[PDB]
Amino acid sequence: ATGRTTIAIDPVTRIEGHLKAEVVVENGKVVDARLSGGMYRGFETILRGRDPRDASQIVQRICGVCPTAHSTASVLALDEAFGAKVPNNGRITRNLIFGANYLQSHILHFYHLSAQDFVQGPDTAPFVPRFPKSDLRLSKELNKAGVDQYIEALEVRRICHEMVALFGGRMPHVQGQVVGGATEIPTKEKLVEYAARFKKVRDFVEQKYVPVVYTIGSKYKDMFKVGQGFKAALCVGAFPLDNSGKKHLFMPGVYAKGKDMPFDPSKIKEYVKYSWFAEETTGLNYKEGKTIPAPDKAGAYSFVKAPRYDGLSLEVGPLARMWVNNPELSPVGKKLLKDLFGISAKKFRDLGEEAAFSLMGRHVARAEETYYMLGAIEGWLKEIKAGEDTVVMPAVPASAEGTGFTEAPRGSLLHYVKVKDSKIDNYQIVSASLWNCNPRDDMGQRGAVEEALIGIPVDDIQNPVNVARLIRAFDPXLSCAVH
Amino acid sequence: GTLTGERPPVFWLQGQGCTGCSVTLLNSVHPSIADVLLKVISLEFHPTVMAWEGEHAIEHMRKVAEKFKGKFFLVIEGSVPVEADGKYCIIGEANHHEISMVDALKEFGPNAAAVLAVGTCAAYGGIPAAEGSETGATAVSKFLGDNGIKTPVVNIPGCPPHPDWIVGTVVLALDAIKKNGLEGGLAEVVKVLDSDGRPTPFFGRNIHENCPYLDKYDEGVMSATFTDKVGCRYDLGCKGPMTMADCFERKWNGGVNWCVQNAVCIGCVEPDFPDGKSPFYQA
Ligand code: SF4
Ligand code: SF4
Ligand code: FCO
Ligand SMILES: [Cl-]
Ligand SMILES: [Fe+2]
Ligand code: NI
Ligand SMILES: [S]
């Protein structure tokens, strides 16, 4: 038996943004963890006093990996506050803009952020140096396939951004989503261009990405047995499928303590005892949220607030959405689960709670979700009407409020805006990596990733690779978490 | 380039950035990002993409920095916040000591061959420095000057920049250095910067004076809805008249669109972005 070693990792790399992780290891396992989001900008105060329409540009600069998610949440909040009635064709165009970035983001995450956890890259920076015992288990052939696919994926993710820009203007930071809809009507010619790129992405997802995740996973079966944490998840709904506001590609729900529950957003509160914000702002629902930095506050260790749902610490992201919604698994996944794992599965929950809520389960969920998004995008390409108007032009209200709910690639996202005297009076953001990468709440309950680190194996304190491997499975984006 | 060619070391530090300046670079078409990384530069430290992590990654950068003192290129993405003794941006920890962005730029800044301030945040302060902020977000050139650090700075702004502006400025510089050595080469680069530190090949021309809708502007034919692509976008908020960038020609994301065709220009390359370009959706 061994005693304690305390390990600090700052920066955690191959994530987005500024994260320190500190873990306590005892006898070869993590027994405690603290996550610190280390960079603050304060978008919620920067936004005050502006024309509300500016928000759908300003907020994207929270995160250049997921700006379409912030764009979407912002325009939905503005739509509600302004009483803007988005035309049907604009709803579909928005889904095509944003859906293309799901493809970009998941591919970026698996290959360009995560795959080096399992694959040795070429012998030059930024692929070396690395831990001397990095636990890289793949055969020469499979490792080379990983490298070849990493390189091909650089082109595929770029093509995904061309898809975003076709109707979104450019990417990062789209111009094409505004209050009232989408700024550019899809033409027949540009829909051909979107479909041609989409075919290439589909082929890569179906033939390379989904198979490689299961194949690498089959060499790391131990990684399905760790990282469970609270086994608790949130989905707030995303990608509206009609104009009612009641039907979405991902439907909302909460899952905790083995039970499905409805999602009621009034049960969200943000705690700050362990966050660098003024103590008197603790425990606020986002409609009354406040952002008062306190970088010298004793005992705090993060610029991420601690969101809790009816007191629960929940995770978000592809696993959360796929668990809550329980879609059928991809044909590839069903086959490889049988061939490589001896698992007979039809729907996502057939993986079982333990394997789904695991380090490798989160990578599998993200690959399955990417495949699932292909079908949604294909459907929108059949549903869109070339030439039909996509925007209305609503007057700015003097006094109003609105909330936009969506699912960023990393998990649940909401923006709340209150308008007074035709200007932003308050703007509050509750983002995906906020739900995942937050610190303890005022009762000392850990954030989702902090809790999922408990039990992670560290058999070699000099090469503690599984700490950041677990973190990377959640695809963190600390710039989103802090804003 | 070749896999066996000369490739200078680059460290990429993120301050108050959004990672969009890294992402835009990943979208480079020619050369592709794979070719940039394997044939043009040696990206020795970059938190988003590098293999190693934590104190080991920091120490690797420090070892390279010592070996290449005066010769590495330092890319900064994001502004540098000076309030609260630098605490609003911590970029790492080594020797049980946290390293703020302030600390990092004071450490590596003096020893770089040049600092490339990539994006409007790094170049000019940008959104983190805008009204309502409270972190003391500071542009790279101002921070270095305030601290007596004389290393040359080149600004490559945009929110985000186009990948071609980033790669193209690197290529400009490396060509000048091949022809003239480091100091002579950087002097040739400085000669082609405008008064805002921007390379004139990319930022020397005005959007509006080169815009395909200029005839409509001059005729007073203005679109009243974003989806009317015939009229000029001025009344919808286009800031093309006050913006120096080549987007009208280069366009974005493989040439598939650009901001003025799709919606409006928001002036994202300009030193007063965002506040001097706001409100975005009226003139
Ligand atoms: S205002 Fe904008 S759309 Fe109109 S001519 Fe100038 S740059 Fe072009
Ligand atoms: S058109 Fe204007 S807003 Fe768009 S990238 Fe160019 S300078 Fe920035
Ligand atoms: N995806 C994404 Fe960004 C994060 N975390 C948001 O919301
Ligand atoms: Cl997104
Ligand atoms: Fe927030
Ligand atoms: Ni993000
Ligand atoms: S992100």
CA distance B141 to B74: 13
Query: Residue A201 Cα, ligand 5 centroid: separation in angstroms?
Result: 34
Cis peptide before A129 (omega within 30 of 0): yes
Provide the 10 A C-beta neighbour count for residue B134: 17
CA distance A210 to B39: 30
Q: What are phi and psi of A419, to 5 degrees?
A: -110, 135
CA distance A424 to A417: 7
Give the list of residues 6+ apart from residue A22 with CB closer than 8 angstroms, or none: A6, A7, A8, A9, A33, A34, A36
Give the list of residues 6+ apart from residue A244 with CB closer than 8 angstroms, or none: none
Q: What are phi and psi of A101, to 5 degrees?
A: -80, -25
Give the list of residues 6+ apart from residue A448 with CB closer than 8 angstroms, or none: A229, A230, A232, A313, A314, A315, A316, A435, A436, A437, A438, A474
CA distance A241 to A235: 16
Between the alpha carbon of residue A421 and those of residues A48, A50, A396, B133, the distances in Å are 12, 10, 10, 21
Residues framing ligand 3 (Cβ under 6 A): A 63, 66, 69, 408-410, 413, 431-433, 477, 480
DSSP category for residue A291: -
Residues of B with CB below 8 A from A39's CB?
A: 14-16, 78, 88-91, 101
Nearest by Cα to B118 from B87, B88, B139, B99: B139
> Which residue numbers of B belong to the known binding site?
18, 21, 77, 120-121, 159, 208, 211, 232, 238, 247, 259, 265, 268
CA distance A391 to A89: 8
Nearest by Cα to A418 from A438, A435, A433, A398: A398
Q: Cβ distance A217 to A469 under 8 Å? A: no
- Give me the residues paired with residue A254 across strands: A234, A261
The one-letter code for the residue type at B209 is E
Provide the 10 A C-beta neighbour count for residue B70: 12
Q: Which of A12, A13, A104 to mutate to test the interface with B (most CBs of B within 10 A)?
A: A13
Residue B152 token pair = 């040359």
Cis peptide before B160 (omega within 30 of 0): yes
CA distance B78 to B84: 18
Residue A120 token pair = 């040795």
Give the distance from residue A423's alpha carbon to the nearest chain B alpha carbon, in angstroms: 11
A66 is in an annotated binding site: yes
Provide the 10 A C-beta neighbour count for residue A149: 22
CB-CB under 8 Å, B225 with A393:
yes
CA distance A476 to A385: 36
CA distance B89 to B137: 10
Q: Cβ distance A166 to B256 under 8 Å? A: yes
- Give me the residues paired with residue B42 across strands: B9
Spacing of C-alpha A324 from chain mean position: 15
Degrees to nearest 5, angle at CA A233 with A227 and A238: 130
CB-CB under 8 Å, B84 with A296:
yes
Count CA atoms within 13 Å of residue A86 on its CB side.
30
- Look up the CATH architecture of domain A4-475: Orthogonal Bundle (1.10)
Nearest CA in chain A to B130: A46
Q: Decide: B258 in ligand 2 pocket, CB within 6 A.
A: yes
Identify the nearest ligand to the CA of B238 by its number: 1
Provide the 10 A C-beta neighbour count for residue A359: 25
Nearest by Cα to B140 from B159, B162, B118: B118
Residue A288 DSSP SS3: helix
CA distance B259 to A73: 21
Residue B129 token pair = 């420095």
Give the list of residues 6+ apart from residue A229 with CB closer than 8 angstroms, or none: A315, A357, A448, A449, A451, A452, A453, A454
Q: Decide: B115 in ligand 2 pocket, CB within 6 A.
A: no
CA distance B151 to A384: 53
CA distance A320 to A85: 30
Q: Which of B33, B227, B243, B282 to mutate to test the interface with A (most CBs of A within 10 A)?
A: B227
CB-CB under 8 Å, A46 with B257:
no
Q: Which residue out of B208, B277, B281 has the highest number of ligand 1 atoms within 8 Å of its CB and is therefore the one to mutate?
A: B208
- Index of the ligand 1 atom closest to the CA of residue B260: 3
Nearest by Cα to A89 from A292, A408, A390: A390
SS3 for chain B, per residue?
Answer: CCCCCCCCEEEEEECECCCHHHHHHHCCCCCCHHHHHHHHCEEEECCCCCCCCHHHHHHHHHHHHHHCCCCEEEEEECEEECHHHHCCEEEEEECCEEEEHHHHHHHHHHHEEEEEEECHHHHHCCHHHCCCCCCCEECHHHHHHHCCCCCCEEEECCCCCCHHHHHHHHHHHHHHHHHHHHHHHHHHHHHCECCCCCEHHHHCCECHHHCCCHHHHHHCCECCCCCCCCCECCCCCCCHHHCECCHHHHCECCCCECHHHHCCCCCCCCCCCCHHHCCCCCC
CB-CB under 8 Å, B18 with A39:
no
Q: What are phi and psi of A479, to 5 degrees?
A: -65, -40
CA distance A418 to A410: 26
- Which residue numbers of B are catalytic? 18, 21, 121, 159, 208, 211, 232, 238, 247, 259, 265, 268
Q: Decide: B258 in ligand 1 pocket, CB within 6 A.
A: no
Give the list of residues 6+ apart from residue B11 with CB closer than 8 angstroms, or none: B44, B45, B46, B61, B64, B65, B72, B73, B74, B75, B108
Provide the 10 A C-beta neighbour count for residue B55: 20
Provide the 10 A C-beta neighbour count for residue B205: 15
Residue A352 token pair = 């079982």
Sign of the CA dihedral B3, B9, B13, B17?
A: negative
Q: Cβ distance A168 to A381 under 8 Å? A: no
CB-CB under 8 Å, A130 with B132:
no
Query: Residue A477 Cα, ligand 3 centroid: separation in angstroms?
Result: 6
Give the list of residues 6+ apart from residue A191 with CB closer than 8 angstroms, or none: A381, A384, A386
Q: Cβ distance B148 to B170 under 8 Å? A: no
Residue A332 DSSP SS3: helix
Q: Decide: B117 in ligand 2 pocket, CB within 6 A.
A: no
Residues of B with CB below 8 A from A176's CB?
A: 262-263
The length of chain A is 483
Give the distance from residue B144's alpha carbon to the nearest chain A alpha carbon, in angstroms: 20
Spacing of C-alpha A426 from chain mean position: 24
- Give me the residues paired with residue B11 across strands: B45, B74
The structure tokens 């290529």 sit at B171
Q: Cβ distance B166 to B160 under 8 Å? A: no
Of B54, B133, B134, the CB nearest to A9: B54
Nearest CA in chain A to B24: A172
Give the distance from residue B152's alpha carbon to the nearest chain A alpha carbon, in angstroms: 25
Nearest CA in chain A to B237: A54
Sign of the CA dihedral A381, A386, A388, A392?
A: positive
Judged on CB neighbours under 10 Å (0-12, 13-18, 19+), A349 is middle
Question: What DSSP assignment string belongs to A125-151?
Answer: TTS-S--TT------HHHHHHHHHHHH
Give the distance from residue A327's alpha carbon to the nearest chain B alpha carbon, in angstroms: 31
The structure tokens 């450490």 sit at B107
Q: Decide: B72 in ligand 2 pocket, CB within 6 A.
A: no
Q: Which residue out of A430, A431, A471 has the highest number of ligand 3 atoms within 8 Å of its CB and is therefore the one to mutate?
A: A431
This entry's atomic model was obtained through X-ray
**Buried b or exposed e, range B224-237, using 16+ CB within 10 angstroms:** ebbbbeebbbbbbb
Identify the nearest ligand to the CA of A304 by its number: 5
Q: Cβ distance A240 to A91 under 8 Å? A: yes
Give the distance from residue A96's alpha carbon to the nearest chain B alpha carbon, in angstroms: 15
Domain boundaries, chain B: 1-202, 203-283
Of B18, B131, B266, the CB nearest to A64: B18
Query: Residue B23 Cα, ligand 2 centroid: separation in angstroms?
Result: 16
